[PDB]
């Protein structure tokens, strides 16, 4: 890796399809705001899943890891002050073959506290929250990011810490 890190957040609750991208990292510091890449909030479509989470750090540069192709970006959610430091994520249950559980939200705590609610999809649950650290990196498990809106989906994703 380029930026070290002394550990890595993850949550019980999301799948396990799809292929890990690239761990992208803040170049200095850490990230305190995330946009995400969702389908518009219409009707008819049928509901699929997120395609992408993309973190802004307080050093203005911004990262992603493995997206997909669907969906629009949403404007940022930011720290209201400090930066992000625990993720929870919302996904329905599954069964033994179709492990319907791709990220349909996710939502993060700031260090002050603040409770930011991505604007997604609201079918599932919200899991338990992950624990505490300083959230500098990420990386996402997503299911066929170039095929088509049918099975591509973020299954996964996972944040590194730093000092």
């Known amino acids: 890796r380029t930026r070290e890190y002394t550990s890595v957040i993850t949550v019980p609750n999301g799948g396990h399809w799809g292929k890990w991208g690239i761990r992208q990292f803040c170049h200095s510091g850490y990230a305190n705001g995330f946009a995400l890449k969702v ?18 750090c307080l050093d203005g540069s911004v990262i992603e ?16 002050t400090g930066y992000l430091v625990s993720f929870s994520l ?6 033994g073959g179709g492990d319907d559980t791709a990220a349909n939200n996710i939502q993060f705590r700031c260090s002050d506290e603040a ?26 498990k997503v299911e066929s ?3 088509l809106r049918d099975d591509t989906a973020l299954n996964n994703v996972r944040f590194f810490c730093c000092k």
């Open 90 to 95: 919302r996904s329905e249950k599954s069964q």
């Open 39 to 56: 389908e518009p909030s219409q009707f008819g479509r049928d509901d699929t899943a997120l395609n992408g989470i993309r973190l802004r």
């Open 115 to 140: 409770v930011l609610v991505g604007d997604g999809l609201s079918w599932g649950r919200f899991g338990p929250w992950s624990k505490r650290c300083k959230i500098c990196g990420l990386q996402t």
């Open 145 to 147: 990011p170039q095929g």
């Open 65 to 80: 890891s493995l997206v997909g192709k669907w969906g629009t970006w949403t404007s940022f959610l930011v720290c209201p």
